[PDB]
């Protein structure tokens, strides 16, 4: 949480919308200027400010190729800002909708590997993310995916979603790595369907009720059976039966190096 002087921050275009996200530039003194992402908080409470900046605090604890990098913060003026690395291709879900059918299965598995490795590391550092979703994964020009948006994260040492959340985490507020793994399975589905909304237009209560009756998302079109099986493994009712992130990583790497294991289609 490195406190950045506002003179060093130049705010360019708005790239998104309790505040906005901007493309920007940064002239740290002695550094070559770089492009940045600037998340601001609408300037009108102390409590809202603290919980906005806490994301930065948690984000600044990590150093990993698949975790979003923090350049620094602005907290002594308004609006308060969290300044992160600039990710050319935006959010993963809208980026895949923009490139529908135009990445290979191997490329897609590579994106899922990166997300998985980022989560392995977050689980190892003792954090539960609690909001892992394709919209919270950002992608750079080389197609590296980085886990982002640590605002609901918990160090274990508006209208809130439900369709990325484990059944036990919905029903009893019991969030763990194991629940993150459930979310990772939904991200998998989101990737292999090139940015479809989970459960389509099923209501929040329809999702909750369907899950309870052992319904699970059907395989996206042209999805490999092994990938669909990993999704199912991620969505086991009993959380102790779900693979850990280490295992997920290893499974994917096994696919990567055995590409013929990805030719058999589920659906």
From Swiss-Prot:
Changing residue 130 to Q: In a gastric adenocarcinoma sample; somatic mutation. Phosphorylated. Autophosphorylation is stimulated by the ligand EFNB1. Required for interaction with SH2 domain-containing interactors, for activation of the MAPK/ERK and JUN signaling cascades and for ubiquitination by CBL. Ubiquitinated; (EFNB1)ligand-induced poly- and/or multi-ubiquitination by CBL is regulated by SRC and leads to lysosomal degradation. Residues 1-267 are cytoplasmic. Preferentially expressed in brain. Residues 9-256 form the Protein kinase domain. GO terms for molecular function: ATP binding; axon guidance receptor activity; protein-containing complex binding; transmembrane-ephrin receptor activity. ATP binds at residues 15-21, 39. GO terms for biological process: angiogenesis; axon guidance; camera-type eye morphogenesis; cell chemotaxis; cell-substrate adhesion; central nervous system projection neuron axonogenesis; dendritic spine development; dendritic spine morphogenesis. Keywords: ATP-binding, Cell adhesion, Cell membrane, Cell projection, Endosome, Glycoprotein, Kinase, Membrane, Neurogenesis, Nucleotide-binding, Phosphoprotein, Receptor, Repeat, Signal, Transferase, Transmembrane, Transmembrane helix, Tyrosine-protein kinase, Ubl conjugation. The active site is at residue 131. It is found in: Cell membrane; Early endosome membrane; Cell projection, Dendrite. GO terms for cellular component: axon; cytosol; dendrite; early endosome membrane; endoplasmic reticulum; extracellular exosome; extracellular region; filopodium tip. Heterotetramer upon binding of the ligand. The heterotetramer is composed of an ephrin dimer and a receptor dimer. Oligomerization is probably required to induce biological responses. Interacts with EPHB6; transphosphorylates EPHB6 to form an active signaling complex. Interacts with PICK1. The ligand-activated form interacts (residues within the catalytic domain) with GRB2 (via SH2 domain). Belongs to the protein kinase superfamily. Tyr protein kinase family. Ephrin receptor subfamily. Receptor tyrosine kinase which binds promiscuously transmembrane ephrin-B family ligands residing on adjacent cells, leading to contact-dependent bidirectional signaling into neighboring cells. The signaling pathway downstream of the receptor is referred to as forward signaling while the signaling pathway downstream of the ephrin ligand is referred to as reverse signaling. Cognate/functional ephrin ligands for this receptor include EFNB1, EFNB2 and EFNB3. This is Ephrin type-B receptor 1. It comes from Homo sapiens (Human).
